[model samples]
Target: KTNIEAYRDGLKLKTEEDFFACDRQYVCQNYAPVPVVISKGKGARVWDINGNEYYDFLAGVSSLSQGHCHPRVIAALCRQAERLTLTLRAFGNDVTGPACRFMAEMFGYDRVLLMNTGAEAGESALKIARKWAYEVKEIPPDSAKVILCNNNYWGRTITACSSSTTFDCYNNFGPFTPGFELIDYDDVGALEEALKDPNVAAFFVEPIQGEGGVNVPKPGYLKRAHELCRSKNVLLIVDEIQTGLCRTGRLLAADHDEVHPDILLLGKSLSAGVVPISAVMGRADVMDVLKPGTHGSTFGGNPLACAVAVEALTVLKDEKLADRAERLGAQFRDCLRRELYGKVPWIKEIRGRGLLNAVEVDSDAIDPNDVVMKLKENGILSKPTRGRVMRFIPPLVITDEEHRDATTRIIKSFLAVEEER
Candidate 1:
């Protein structure tokens, strides 16, 4: 209590302007941020520098599934910290194999190659696909094309941006990588048309597009796409970097349709927001393509990361976080539909599976940024993706009381915004 008080006192001394000013000067101005400056977190809540508490609906943009300062995740790291942390891929480590094996079994994949971030995993998946295409499929060298879904966000990497159709992801970042094509996200015909070209090596997609406003595809979209991939001999890579690990109602959003991709990309909650760890999990034949010195990351699959990842996966299972997400999401959305649906004209739609959800507003009627700021002031924290859509993914571990409280606050905030107009 004393430490918290002291921290709060010190925090109050520095105005939001001071922090913003420091960041604006020192931090690269790449990220436009919400005004609040977050400092501490616990469970499903976060405290800003001014000691104001807010419910963490975003959960570090769906990274903290185990919630902030998850005890098991912390314990795993603390114990591993005293023993060993980074061994680098130069030599092998004890925990890396176990972690790989655990993830493979967890997701029903043949192998797992660890990386440090979602973008790195995406890059690795592409590399694996390209290599597999040349060696196994016998495509012309460097003519191996990969197709991406339009409005898909893999991260800010050069190749990822090249595959993106969004202005923000690709505006000035070119001259970009070649051998990439973008098709409409939910259009199975478009995907099939692109795959008709023999040189196409892989079709990369997200089961539920996250940064693209939590866009859930048509009912049988992924299933049909996987079937097409199988028939056409193209690799199907599903980027579950945001939607995996029970962020979606199912373990993987692909599980909804029972479609398994040739390559699965995982990250974000892979370490339960404890450390930086992402993975490329795929079939043995595909993963084994990269030989001795082909590709490696210095800090990928380090002992600390492996330990944390194992614990993160364990926590998800032990808590039955997926089921919890399913139940809570249904409950929350039901409340929204019943209470806030017609009352708030700006909230055009409320759609998502599990806790990964978004409230799409009528941008012409209201700027969602205003609602987001209002929610923040009213003891909730959320952000708008693109312009009109606000994502509302509270941590899976959020308590029943916290869940109800957050819903109430959302309603109140919405009503308040409506009242203002």
Candidate 2:
């Protein structure tokens, strides 16, 4: 047995000290997941604790875009940890400032503020938008509302959940913090109408709705949204946390459009899932609204994170993962559409740009989770999203051959599923 599986079944685990063989309720429930543990991972492959190996298609939900245990980032982390580990936002560190500078310049923003989680970055940007509205736009204090697309996900904070249209995800979560006005996603006219409200400060949206089933809006939806925001003096804020950093076959999803956001919030793939680092990049005047002591995270811009980030972005640039995404992703889509279309009616649609794509199964009759289970059985790992979509975000570091194999495996599994039922 492999180390992880050996430990899980009988061997690394001298005791249950490493992690739960089963989860216990800090929240008041005791539950156990499948007794699968992992020994190690390299590139797109992983060894389970039980000695079975699988291709890691999840890539930590696109967190490990550099693929598993990227050497450059590993080296940078060791080097940075040797020098220093942290300097909180209360004081500046050598790494944070330069990391911020890199992200701001990379995204065409003049300034940036760092945070550790996707939610924190989302909240930070929200605060900046409000401050900009009250100070720059001369809006009445406490009255500035942000326009959020319906079914949008910024992250899991009170403020972020307040904007969610998915009731169950937000259900029992709150009397939720308000001041968010929701509009139909991809309906640019509805967005324009909402922006026309003088109380609005910013429009928070994902360029491609990655979670709402990898839903892509009509052509020019974002471009038109930008136009409306510009006309109305509203800030256009795009959440790039889940969809940025060459995962979508490009550096920025906004690059797909002639339009760009006034505020660009990014995380996830930033550290290639090596570290938890996130940033809000925007115009200096807008970004600078977060004054001293107003917003920060202790572990946000630490020495190790920034150092790894520098190397992570460097890997994307050096290896040309983004370009690879564009070329291989086209092949993947063609392979799927040809092999699986009409063959499986549950796959209502297959849409994606670059390597970031989704096989949507949003029908009343079909259970999307079934496809996830079957894919796992077939040795490809992907997950259901918003109930009926399987998000297929493999690492950009994945090879063309691996991509083809994954597509073939998915087709075989999907076909097997259809045949069985």
Candidate 3:
């Protein structure tokens, strides 16, 4: 048994309700999580404290693309932890440089800045773009502006909150940051008009708006945006923290549009959910704007995370996970659309690319929570974004047999909910 299982076995608070009460008494109540206490996980499956098993369809919101506790990633992490864990960027380390070189080549960028979370990566990219605008593009001092789409979800940082269009994200977060321009996503005309400003430094966007309800843009939206940014000499910053790294079938979701972003952001699955790590990649001219001491993180690029990241990325390439995601995602969507659409009026739409899929429902017709409960009862666990778009983002490492079984369970759950309604 794993350490978590051992802890669960030894816990004084044995029941799920007991743990929930403990959390209510002590832990912060910022997130409203489903009331299932998971004690162990491996691959696409997780075990509740009471030993009930579930196929985890959320997969850490696409952070566990290599699956939970991958042996290779765990091995790398353990081996490195035993020797060296952290050596701040102030000091040199054997792992950080080579690991970054690996990423630089893999992603076709001249430089790679490592950070600890997706939010940090987005913030770093924004900082780099603004600085590059001032130094290279010669935008007037503090006047450099970054254009972003409405409903874009990056991170919960103050700056990220500032750029967000969501009420819950920005409301009561007071004294927001400035120099951000908001426009409708998937609309090149809005982007073109936004870029007309001479002080605009970059266009920050997600290839597919993940938290914004997985809003997939029109074909060539990214390509046209890139072209417009190029014409204005503005940087195109693609935030692929959730959609990149084989989650959407392509190595980077931007590859679907054949657009190479001036600045690229990647996180979530970069370390295969083993450790917190994020990356910002760009050309030397742009990235070099950050001189020595301008930006740094204490745990960023530590040897432990670097070792795990190299191994995790290796797993993606060796296992051919991108190809697997592409094939399995098609199968999943086909099954859902064939079974759910037309037959179920409550299901407004079923859409996604690769394994990052959603089943949007009419909230008025059926309570989404009922569907969630049915899915939990049927041995499939998932969460919805915006309280309506039921997400089904399983780990890419799920076996073909496991995926087929989970697909069947998912369809059954939706049908059962519909029947009850």
Candidate 4:
């Protein structure tokens, strides 16, 4: 019998609908998840509560680049938990220091500041940029401004919300934070004009706009932006929460442009989706501005996350996942383009670098949910962003055979939807 049949035979709830009703009554429904209650995940696949198997195309939005419950990462977590979990950075911890050192050497930074989530890392980077401006650049007190792109998405924190141009993200989340200047993505002229302000402290940006509908900037956008920031004594804070850790076929997405950021933010896959951990790294001169007590998280440098992050980073290196993503991503796009581009009239554009790819559908021409449902029905699970951009960010550790099978199913899903239309 199939996995789904086995699960259904031994299900706790009378039916799947009962579970949904239970969730509706108790859970604080901030997210509208797809109609699948996943019970377990391994590698690039997940099994629903009913035991149906599917290729997890989203991969926790690239958080599971090492795949679900990776042996190494889970081992590290268990090992660390048995020894010590949290020391709170209030006192010394053997694991935390060495973990930072490992990351520093790996990422080529002098110091590493660990945090709990991608948003915390972004916030810490901003704080560092602002402080460095005040102490080093002498940007006249609170006048230090941070330049960001219009469609940027770092997090839902108030400061992040304040800088967001998307209505749904920032709407009614006021009064918002100040000292932010917004500019258009992929436009060097806009960046050049914005940096003219002497009070500018840093330009905070995502190497590839993740939550902003997977918008890839122009090739030289980041390199040129860095040059401009350097000329004006402003920091180039590259937020790689979604695009870092081999997600975009590079250790850091900024590596593609050969732009070493002044302040770097990393998260998501930092712990291989096993735990929450993020980091901000930079040279001593820039990162040291925080000083002691100016910045500290109770659980920021906890030993548990430290050990897991080190193991996670190790897995990436050992598996050479960056290379895997690069090869497989090209094939995925080629297959989709060859099969669906002109034939699927609703497909607007297919764009991305490496495994970080998307198929933008014309919403006016077709209901995107139909494609989503078809994909799910065909044993491929995915989600769309901005209600149009269907993303296909599977784990980098997905084997060639599994990727080939998933790619065939994905293309078939799109074609089946088109045939129905």
Candidate 2 — worst ten consecutive residues by lDDT sum? 25-34
lDDT of 2 at 18: 42
Clashes within 3 Å, all models in order: 0, 6, 0, 1
On lDDT, the leading prediction is 3
| Cα misplacement distance, residue 35 of candidate 4 (Å) | 1.4
User: Residue 230 error for model 3, in Å?
Assistant: 0.5
Query: How do the residues 1-421 of candidate 3 rate in per-residue lDDT, one tens digit apiece?
Result: 9997688568678788889987888889998955599888999999998999999999999999999999999999999999999989999989999999999999999999999999999999999999999999997889999999999999999999999999999999979999999999999999999999999999999999999998989998999999989988999999989999999999999999998889999888999999999999999999999999999999989999999999999999999999999999999999999999988899998888989999999999999999999999999989999999999999999999999999999999999887887
In candidate 2, what are the lDDT values of residues 186-256, reduced to their tens digit? Answer: 99879877877898999998988877778888888888888889998999999888888887788888778
lDDT of each: 0.90, 0.82, 0.93, 0.92
Candidates sorted by lDDT, best first: 3, 4, 1, 2
Query: Against the true structure, what is each candidate's TM-score?
Result: 0.96, 0.92, 0.98, 0.96
| Root-mean-square deviation of every model | 2.5, 3.2, 1.6, 3.2
Instruction: Give the higher-TM-score candidate: 1 or 2.
Output: 1
**How good is model 1 by TM-score?**
0.96
Clashes of 3: 0
The TM-score ranking, best first, is 3, 4, 1, 2
